[PDB]
Each structure stands twice: as C-alpha cells, then as structure tokens.
Amino acid sequence: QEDVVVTLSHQGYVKYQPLSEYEAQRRGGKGKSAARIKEEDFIDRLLVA
DNA sequence: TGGCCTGCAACGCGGGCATCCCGATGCCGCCGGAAGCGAGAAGAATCATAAGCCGTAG
DNA sequence: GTACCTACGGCTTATGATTCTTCTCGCTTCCGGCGGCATCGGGATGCCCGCGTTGCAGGCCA
After folding, report:
1. A12 sits within 7 Å of strand C by its CB
2. Distance of C1' in B6 from CA in A36, Å
3. How far is CA A9 from CA A1, A12, A27, in A?
4. Which of A11, A12, A19 is nearest to A47 (CA)?
5. CA-CA to A49 of 20 to 30 Å: which in A3, A5, A11, A22?
6. Which nucleotide is nearest, taking the CA of residue A29 and each C1'?
7. Are the C-beta atoms of A16 and A4 separated by less than 8 Å?
8. E strands in A1-49
C-alpha cells in the first residue's frame, strides 16, 4: 500500500512521501522568512492515491 | 534562539449612492460543420486437432 | 551377433479456425454557429467619513 501523497511544484519537480511523514512535516507554522524570497517555489498540484 | 501575531494608535481611500455612457445579450434570420453510429473490414486472443516421453505390458 | 511397433495416462508445442475487439468510411441533417439590432443591467466617476491599512511595540510560537 505505502500510503503517500504526490506533490508537484511550480518549477516542475515531482515527488512523493508517506502520509505519516507528510503530516509530521506539516505540523507547525510556515515562516515568512522564506516567503520574502520572490523567486521561491511552491506546490502546484497535490493528490493522495 | 530567532521570528510571528496582535493590541494601540495614526493615516488614508473606497463603499456606497446615481447616473451617463457602455458592453453583453436575447431574439431573429441565414449558413456551416460534425455527429450519427451503423456497417465493412482487419488484427488478435482463444479454442480445436496432432505428437513426444515418462515405464511396464503385449 | 546385430532393432522395430503400440497401449495405458498427463504437460508441452506447432498450426489452423472462430469470434471479439478495434480501425476506418458513409453522406447527410440537425444542432449549432454567426451577423445584426433594441434592450437592460453594469462600470466609473463626484464625495465623505469611517472602517481598512499600516507603523511600533509587546507577548507568544516553531
């Protein structure tokens, strides 16, 4: 099974990681220190299968 | 340990109100294209019909 | 001295036939596509003040 989530970035990077690790990394608030970068990358598409 | 949310205070701009100009649009009439799947034809998966050898018997 | 046939049963290997599935054509008609006009709801601008926005400092969070 290996329940994972597939996240596609805006620059075209595709990858997946298990749902447990994804929920563990999701814990906490996103720091605006990285948001000050106008050339960063963000998630474009998300799906769980 | 570094950074983020929020309270307090000061500043500014747009929401609301109306209307004049404006842009879509519903309707009417004339013209275009695609769908319509039904049917013909081809390719492929599956089913049907022979042997080869395993070892004692003739 | 020196080889040559099938019967009893199970799994494969080689080849043709059959039906399922899919590729491709059929013109036509109906649903739609498109041009034009009166209409009706909408956007922007004039104006004000009060709420939205923002600077600064404090306490809390990852």
Report:
1. no
2. 21
3. 24, 5, 20
4. A19
5. A11
6. C62
7. yes
8. 4-9, 14-18, 43-48
